[model samples]
Target: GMEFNHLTKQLNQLLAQDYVAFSITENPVVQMLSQASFAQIAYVMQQYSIFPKELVGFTELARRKALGAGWNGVAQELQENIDEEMGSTTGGISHYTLLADGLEEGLGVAVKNTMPSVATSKLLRTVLSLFDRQVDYVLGATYAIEATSIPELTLIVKLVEWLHEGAIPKDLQYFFSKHLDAGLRTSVAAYIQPEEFGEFAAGFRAMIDAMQVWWQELAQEAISSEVVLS
Candidate 1:
């Protein structure tokens, strides 16, 4: 009963502006970073570094999804992505480590142990909560996340290029380029039923709202720090 086109349209209708906010032109932190010093940009990168760690933490959620579904495709798709995200069998580095390479090795900025701010924690908590919900809800959350991945990463890629005054370093390129997940979104959308559409939409909208709030919090902090520094 659930068509991918319908689901995509509904999501777009609900999240059009939120998705736009994911762009550098619409994102406040990106704007702030454009005017920021190298050290200040480095500080902002430190705040963002925790995201890869939290993102990889979704393996448990993927495990839950894979086991709960009897459908072979769902399990296989989730497993493949999980493998890539964790770099488990490849003997390659995780995105978390790659981000470290970007921050410290490529950019010459030292990594720090500073805890995530309250707002950052809030965004993480909201996203993690989706994994604990029903499959329909999880799919919705994941769709929203995966759908935004390309645009979100584009914003980061451009931010890195602007900061570097050209292309992003090789170390950071992997971090920003490997997250396009349109295929994953379609895979997730395939399983949603008509009856579950409401929950799915609710989950999708909730993620968008939380993401907007998270960016607003980061933007406010950037501005406040700018004030103090000036």
Candidate 2:
């Protein structure tokens, strides 16, 4: 996959760090968001909210293709997770509101209300690449998006709850908080199973093993080079 030699360019992007960022319960974004002021947090939310259309539509785009490939049960479960990502309910009542609503309704600004910074543009550009990639690789990107997001968003949820207390609306946390690992685990296993990828899966295990060193080194550089805040 990522023959990541030149760190100079990759060193400065939003969501730039490698897997090591998520290897912990708290990385720089989580740490920053936890301490961010309401306006500051709104800024973060604004940047993050730029992609609701691309993201919300991704499951339908991916799962429709997945269905074409003949994995109906898996597609259904994945769609359920995607629906949960949009809005999960405890009863007929939603436990949280939709992602698009959060920044506007709860955080005080809609995704388009603020001009996007470079980081927001970078993320939007990346979403385009996701659309172009092979579905197998897209699965990696999909899994990476949802799986890696949990920890950072988990922290955001806690800090949001503490900040708002009872005033925090159900929609505030569902973008990340509502989604669970149920579908993700199934897909990850399917993609990486020895029978699926065969020797390549083992080789990927090897690749990941080697990249632990590269990712940590990259993490140090990226974290240190993060000169400004989002």
Candidate 3:
């Protein structure tokens, strides 16, 4: 039988760090816009708010459950740190909705063009399904998203900073700085030790691969208006 407690610990550690890093990196895009005209800043913020907030909420829940399952006290401490970091996320969320509001004012395209993929819908469903049936698998899937997202977000952070001036904020600089350190710490602490956790890692990789494939197919199907490759 799969060990739920062991897997939960690994999952929480993996997700907690990923969330921390992701939040830090992405927050800069919003923070940098603090000085822009209210309209310009609002546009940028809306474009970014597309990220799924529920993901963070679930990760926090999973972290608490993992702690109850005998995770080390350090895990709890990390969770607290994550909570503090998340306090800055509301601004990002506001930007997201605000950007949506201003899309018609001169922003080139419709907001639906940039709408978060229906894949997000599938991903959420898959998460709930796994959570109900096999908790370990749910953890595996969670790990997969967080793992992939860390690097994706790093790239997004760089792109936003390089492509636009004032695309980062001073108060939010710490958010981008901490991702690499926290991601590594969480990955290693949760899944790299004692070897048994390796099983969960393998499962996570598989779930991610499957999900990516489905997402790619969905993109292909949805891109009929453009010639872009999925």
lDDT of 2 by residue, 99-148 (tens): 44554565555655555555555545545555445444444445444533
In model 3, what are the clashing residue pairs, if there are any? 24-175, 32-168, 32-169, 45-95, 46-95, 46-99
- Clashing pairs in model 2? 96-170, 97-171
For model 3, how does the per-residue alpha-carbon lDDT over 26-83 read when each residue is reduced to its tens digit? Answer: 3333334334344344333333344434455555655654455555443464465455
Weakest 10 consecutive residues of candidate 2 by summed lDDT: 1-10
lDDT of 1 by residue, 19-45 (tens): 545765877677676567766665656
Report the C-alpha displacement of residue 131, candidate 1, in angstroms. Answer: 2.4
* Backbone steric clashes in candidate 3, count: 6
- Could you tell me which 10 consecutive residues in candidate 3 have the lowest summed lDDT? 93-102
Positional deviation of residue 217's Cα in model 3 after best superposition, in angstroms? 4.0
> What order do candidates take by lDDT, descending?
1, 2, 3
Which stretches in model 1 have alpha-carbon errors above 4 Å?
12-20, 69-72, 88-91, 112-114, 165-167, 174-182, 226-230
What local distance difference test score does each model get? 0.67, 0.47, 0.46
Per-model TM against the reference: 0.82, 0.56, 0.48
Positional deviation of 176 in candidate 3, in angstroms? 5.4
